[PDB]
Design an enzyme around this catalytic site. Structure first.
Site, PDB file in Angstrom:
ATOM      1  N   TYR A  94      26.651  42.376  48.891  1.00 19.56           N
ATOM      2  CA  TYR A  94      27.337  43.191  49.194  1.00 19.56           C
ATOM      3  C   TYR A  94      25.853  44.955  48.881  1.00 19.56           C
ATOM      4  CZ  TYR A  94      31.800  43.072  49.913  1.00 19.56           C
ATOM      5  OH  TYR A  94      33.026  42.488  50.626  1.00 19.56           O
ATOM      6  N   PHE A 107      39.764  42.516  40.802  1.00 20.05           N
ATOM      7  CA  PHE A 107      40.331  42.783  42.246  1.00 20.05           C
ATOM      8  C   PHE A 107      39.634  42.625  43.204  1.00 20.05           C
ATOM      9  CE2 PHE A 107      38.193  46.649  40.686  1.00 20.05           C
ATOM     10  CZ  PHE A 107      37.171  46.570  41.919  1.00 20.05           C
TER      11      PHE A 107
HETATM   12  C1  LIG Z   1      40.651  37.924  45.634  1.00 23.97           C
HETATM   13  N1  LIG Z   1      40.641  38.420  44.911  1.00 23.97           N
HETATM   14  C2  LIG Z   1      39.557  37.384  43.872  1.00 23.97           C
HETATM   15  C3  LIG Z   1      39.444  38.261  42.826  1.00 23.97           C
HETATM   16  C4  LIG Z   1      41.451  37.787  41.686  1.00 23.97           C
HETATM   17  C5  LIG Z   1      42.090  38.974  42.585  1.00 23.97           C
HETATM   18  C6  LIG Z   1      43.336  39.026  41.633  1.00 23.97           C
HETATM   19  S1  LIG Z   1      44.192  38.830  42.878  1.00 23.97           S
HETATM   20  C7  LIG Z   1      44.590  40.319  44.210  1.00 23.97           C
HETATM   21  N2  LIG Z   1      43.762  40.883  43.851  1.00 23.97           N
HETATM   22  C8  LIG Z   1      44.248  41.564  45.277  1.00 23.97           C
HETATM   23  N3  LIG Z   1      43.125  43.272  44.990  1.00 23.97           N
HETATM   24  C9  LIG Z   1      44.784  42.289  46.035  1.00 23.97           C
HETATM   25  C10 LIG Z   1      45.688  43.053  46.887  1.00 23.97           C
HETATM   26  C11 LIG Z   1      46.495  42.803  47.826  1.00 23.97           C
HETATM   27  S2  LIG Z   1      46.953  40.601  47.067  1.00 23.97           S
HETATM   28  C12 LIG Z   1      45.180  40.761  46.139  1.00 23.97           C
HETATM   29  N4  LIG Z   1      46.121  39.627  45.016  1.00 23.97           N
HETATM   30  C13 LIG Z   1      47.097  43.284  49.122  1.00 23.97           C
HETATM   31  C14 LIG Z   1      46.816  44.216  49.021  1.00 23.97           C
HETATM   32  C15 LIG Z   1      45.793  45.051  47.673  1.00 23.97           C
HETATM   33  C16 LIG Z   1      44.529  44.151  47.707  1.00 23.97           C
HETATM   34  C17 LIG Z   1      42.236  38.172  44.206  1.00 23.97           C
END
Ligand SMILES: CN1CCC[C@H](CSc2nc(N)c3c4c(sc3n2)CCCC4)C1
Ligand SMILES: CN1CCC[C@H](CSc2nc(N)c3c4c(sc3n2)CCCC4)C1
Ligand SMILES: CN1CCC[C@H](CSc2nc(N)c3c4c(sc3n2)CCCC4)C1
Ligand SMILES: CN1CCC[C@H](CSc2nc(N)c3c4c(sc3n2)CCCC4)C1
Ligand SMILES: [Cl-]
Ligand SMILES: [Cl-]
Ligand SMILES: [Cl-]
Ligand SMILES: [Cl-]
Ligand SMILES: [Cl-]
Ligand SMILES: [Cl-]
Ligand SMILES: [Cl-]
Ligand SMILES: [Cl-]
Ligand SMILES: [Cl-]
Ligand SMILES: [Cl-]
Ligand SMILES: [Cl-]
Ligand SMILES: [Cl-]
Ligand code: NA
Ligand code: NA
Ligand code: NA
Ligand code: NA
Ligand code: NA
Ligand code: NA
Ligand code: NA
Ligand code: NA
EC number: 2.3.1.-
Lengths: 396, 396, 396, 396
Positions: C120, C396
């Site tokens: 990044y 996130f």
């Molecule tokens: C991968 N990433 C690593 C670090 C932790 C993180 C927490 S779980 C998570 N996070 C998101 N940003 C989202 C989104 C979903 S579903 C979901 N789930 C659909 C549309 C919006 C984005 C998960």
């Protein structure tokens, strides 16, 4: 393939088989010291395919048994069959010849330390002492209010270099070995070897230190690789005061996380602490093995518990005789009989009972010891029990 | 901060403290089964500030002691102080109140399993049984010629589903617990819990199987992660034949490398094999802890070894009374006296002696037990020794 | 291969790529909650040419920066290229389109959490917060005489079930996020997700508990496999009293050996103990990454240290503008200029400086930040430094 | 038990206690070199209580503090109490006597390296530098476009044998130690010891190599057991060019998987790479500890940040005096007063602030540092901050 007493010319071949058979083999100059304990005709070799393909010998030892009685003991040792000559019955032939010589020489018992647990039962050897490794997490260790030597005034224990206090170690050990079942006389040559093994080796063991009390000593060294582990190679204490004082000093090794020692199941150390659980049993194994060569001589020689009342029974040892056994006032009389057996056991089982480390009841529950009378079992248990806990002197 | 018997409304708060305090806490529906063993006024809670910040209770148990005597026993359990309220003397206040109630209710003894080894000594509890983990490398295991049940004809042992043979397990256990020191009556609700714990949990323990003999059973399961390890959760045998037959079946688990069991130091299993060393002691720990509530009631209730001859002494328990102790013909009489003490010990030490798991001599060597007479020590050792080895029934 | 805003029909294809790309992907019903934070035109997909082979989006976030200023922030998230379509420049094309939309929408900054550290930087993102794992061996932990909340009277901390005190957690977090650089507004849907993740999963995580103070909370659970490790998922304290009180309660988890937490480099916890070394740094990693979208808007929006005196310089961001930067009385004015640059840096470096987690001097020593004036370097260091230590809100 | 300056006859007893106390104790011939740094009356011994049961000494050192000011420093060292004499207050008595002598001799500061983190706080020592282990997976390591020394032409770095370039190492180190807070003068005898430690030991460490730049050097060796790990024992660079050039050479060790170094928290190495995450923090610990012996002498001797404007306050050190502290134009004036204190702290806290490694705000948040004025806290933070990052010279 013939079986002979080795000549001086056979010993280089025996040291080669030794180096290939024993990972803890120091070498020929150290082997000279141990050889002084091998009597004339104490050794057999098998030649092919001509080189040495098998060897076995015994050393002249003195073993303390219950009642502070010291028995002449044949210490079986240096037993090896070449990897080229397995499954030719060489061990059976060497053990048969040495047992003949040991019996004829008038040894009441033979003893050994077993490289494996499955070999020596069939030759009449039973495990007779139990090695117990305690590992103490000394960071949590607090001595109980009741523990001796926890008051004002000076310490009775000194931190010393082992080589400068040989006389004191020898004298304390001599007192120890005479009063403890499993005790062995340690001759001068084995004190020479012990103290040479106490110096630091380049790329080997670290320097050994001693904690010295008038009535006890501990030899310890920091582990090769785990620099937070202190290994106690040997702790000999003649009084409870000495034992507690030495452990106060060992728990005072503030740069260590853990103290380890190979001791016996009745070591009082756990009971010296407010948390008995801090003294962890990390390892348990058979120590000294005994073969009773002469059943009546061995049974009459040791002392028995004065608490059990006089009783008589008939003991059969499998292919080792049947005897009228009368035990009273801490002594046994053991005479030939053809009267019906009340107790039967293999010779190895008697070896396991002899120093008090195993209960007749436990061996009976495995059917290693047969009787139809459970009262007789209780009586044997109590009579053969040792007042002083059985300990292990040194490996050979 | 006040100390009260909990009302029905307090129990949700107690289950929350339970879930936060005990990693092995199943949950409220399982807690309902155990609660049936808590008598009215068997529980104390401390409220703040109002939520539960401390709790302790006892369960009504039946404990077998030497001589096959069954004592009413207060089983201390569910003891927890909130992490927010440490070092406020809440444990001391709860234990003092429960001991008052236990004593007044007429229990001669209290018992518990200790989460740590350093806590309960100061409240008069002594470790009274020894847990011994044996791990058998079953690939090398051969039964000795002497071992029972190694002939022609059918096997007496059946591989069964635990839930379909509840009646047989119950009946075998009932026989076992009545004849073994450390035995506990297992009520119907704890059989309900044991058999529910024997089914496979999604993402949890594998399915349990049973080996069933007329006079013994073993419950075992393959380990969660080590698929070559079989864990024996429970083996109860009433005869040596049953014990050997069950181990022949366990060593017949040809897809396993290792069998592990939590047993006792006198388990005859090592003596059933040609190589005793294959049955390795991997772990050792205190099992049941005893607090003698009433010294004369406890000492008079148990049987003593018939082998030791009649003897009299004076026993002082620290802040627990002084007694004229007369032991003969396997019975004790224990009466008040102000005569000079010949033996002194804290109440916890007596608990440790009571089922025969620890020798007076060993505790004397740590100075947990004081006398100037070594003959008296030998006599106590022999008298308090248990003919049937002490075992551990089940944790609570 | 074309780049489009996804329709409702594209989302099943996006959830498939999500499940294959992200091991921590819960599933579609949880994805619905997060989707509410994605604005209209917040998402791009690449179709092959038809299935989804690439996707990226941003969420509408509120980020606290030094001076307690809250910036609208585009949270880059759900970025994935199918394993079938690597090295086709799909990430570069998706990031270029989203940055266009983010810039045009009027976001002064974008932010993300990086799955790898090497991706990044080239898109202008710099690591802006530092994750610091502390593991406390709580068995040795003693609080310093100076530490708050170590007196008589009741505890201010309660052990509670998370779901029954949602309102209190929300209110404490809201206070926390507003006063700490790196703080993020946590919307209702992410509180829904956090509390659902706090319950025990069959074959998954253990039940979570909460320690609740009026001015702080800790959420913790015992580890899946290491049953002597407590993992603090989240600790938010608004006062030093709350922070110390919560750690007193955590060190009171007497059944645990170790407490672990992901915190920040300036966590005062080590200084609360008599042995600072007990709070061990076991893990360190970049947390939040920032891309400054609008240099003058970002630089004028945050507060600067009042201690450094008024100074003026010319800052060039590589392909991001040249500005007359005047910093005084804790405020910056940042205006276009063609005057000679005194400071040069890539856009990612400015992101790394922006919340005070990295010193200009450190980046200068790596030549990521160029100047010929070391006085200017000291002034930048002091001005951009954060009075309140920078922390990481939630991933996130 | 009396406390004395040792005579020549005491030193064999001191070397015995040394060998038993310190696992890294080389031996008496190496101890001779270090002894040259111990002034007359620099050592105390306790005799029983007659043998040496306690010892402590200080060495004459020169420590660089912020502003490139070099202070005479008493380096506390060789501190040991025999394991036979714990909990007799021997450490307290030895430290009290040495501090008396150090104070009377006119040392403004004492320093040490702590074997444990919990011992030295109560004697007024605060941790003043932070050791930071970086482990680089060099297989993935690519230098950023911005990193110096990544062009055509020859390398400025040479691979050399350490012993043949002693003069160059000495000269580079001398430049380094004079410009860096935490720098120590390294006398000839410690260069003798360093270069003897750089040769291969039979069964010990592998041969050391040097990377030599005009303005920096790195000493490294392949690990004893992990033959894919290179351990940098020492890297000293006077310029950013030298630091980057040396790391280009270290990342060029193509037969290694990993390079490890003990450095400081502000090491720019992570910022030299395209992936900052490749430079992993594997270990973090307190380095040098400081006891401020004379508060006004120490506070007036060091330089302060020119950025913070002139300010005045009243500092109380617990049982160490109260002072009017005026800081302006990078200098402090520190005079006795009985005016009300605005800042309070124990002597150890001042030691921790003195070289700039810990922020007043962080210690304030733990309540190790008390004030009712948060503006004063910001001012102390900025004033005591070090422009040149604090580093650790060498252990003693
Ligand atoms: C991968 N990433 C690593 C670090 C932790 C993180 C927490 S779980 C998570 N996070 C998101 N940003 C989202 C989104 C979903 S579903 C979901 N789930 C659909 C549309 C919006 C984005 C998960
Ligand atoms: C192997 N075995 C395992 C256990 C420990 C034991 C200690 S070292 C040792 N032991 C001996 N018995 C001997 C003998 C030597 S040399 C030597 N060395 C030549 C002739 C007499 C016997 C070594
Ligand atoms: C913790 N402890 C460790 C060793 C094993 C032991 C088995 S599970 C168990 N044990 C109990 N004593 C109880 C009780 C419950 S619930 C429950 N569960 C409510 C009221 C009565 C006491 C669990
Ligand atoms: C233990 N300590 C840990 C950290 C590393 C340190 C390096 S080796 C060393 N260090 C010394 N200070 C000394 C002294 C000797 S001998 C020696 N050896 C005699 C009189 C003067 C002090 C060793
Ligand atoms: Cl002997
Ligand atoms: Cl054979
Ligand atoms: Cl004791
Ligand atoms: Cl019972
Ligand atoms: Cl308490
Ligand atoms: Cl058998
Ligand atoms: Cl925010
Ligand atoms: Cl790309
Ligand atoms: Cl504190
Ligand atoms: Cl210096
Ligand atoms: Cl002290
Ligand atoms: Cl760079
Ligand atoms: Na024996
Ligand atoms: Na032994
Ligand atoms: Na017992
Ligand atoms: Na048991
Ligand atoms: Na930052
Ligand atoms: Na952080
Ligand atoms: Na410092
Ligand atoms: Na450092």
């Amino acid at each position: 393939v013939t079986l002979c007493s080795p000549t001086e010319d056979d010993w280089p071949g025996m040291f080669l088989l030794a180096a290939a058979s024993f990972t803890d083999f120091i070498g020929p100059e150290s082997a000279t010291a141990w050889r002084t304990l091998v009597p004339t005709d104490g050794a057999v070799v098998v030649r092919d395919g001509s080189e040495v393909v098998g060897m076995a010998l015994y050393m002249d030892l003195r073993l303390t048994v219950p009642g502070e009685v010291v028995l002449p003991t044949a210490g079986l040792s240096f037993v090896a069959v070449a990897p080229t000559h397995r499954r030719r019955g060489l061990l059976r032939a060497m053990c048969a010849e040495l047992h003949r010589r040991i019996a004829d020489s008038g040894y009441p018992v033979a003893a050994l330390h077993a490289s494996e647990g499955g070999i020596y039962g069939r030759f009449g050897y039973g495990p007779a002492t139990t090695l117990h490794e305690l590992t103490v997490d000394r960071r949590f260790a607090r001595f109980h209010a009741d523990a001796p030597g926890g008051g004002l005034g000076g310490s009775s224990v000194r931190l010393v270099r082992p080589t400068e206090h040989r006389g004191e170690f020898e004298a304390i050990y001599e007192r120890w070995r005479q009063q403890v079942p499993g005790g062995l006389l340690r001759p001068q040559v084995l004190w020479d070897e012990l103290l040479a093994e106490a110096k630091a080796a380049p790329g080997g063991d670290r320097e050994s230190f001693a904690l010295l009390h008038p009535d006890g000593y501990a030899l310890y060294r920091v582990d090769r690789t785990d620099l937070k582990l202190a290994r106690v190679s040997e702790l000999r204490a003649v009084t409870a005061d000495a034992h507690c004082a030495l452990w106060r000093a060992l728990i005072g090794l503030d740069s260590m996380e853990r103290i380890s020692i190979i001791t016996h199941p009745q070591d009082p150390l756990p009971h010296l602490l407010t948390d008995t659980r801090l003294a962890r049993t990390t390892w348990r194994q058979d120590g000294l093995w005994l073969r009773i060569m002469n059943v009546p001589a061995a049974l009459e020689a040791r002392g028995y518990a004065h608490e059990v009342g006089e009783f008589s029974t008939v003991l059969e040892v499998s292919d080792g005789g049947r005897f009228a056994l009368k035990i009273g006032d801490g002594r046994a009389r053991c005479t030939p009989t053809d009267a019906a057996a009340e107790i039967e056991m293999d010779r190895d089982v008697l070896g396991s009972l002899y120093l008090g480390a195993h209960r007749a009841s436990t061996l009976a529950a495995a059917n290693r010891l047969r009787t139809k009378d459970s009262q007789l079992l209780r009586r044997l248990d109590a009579a053969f029990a040792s007042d002083v806990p059985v300990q292990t002197a040194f490996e050979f």
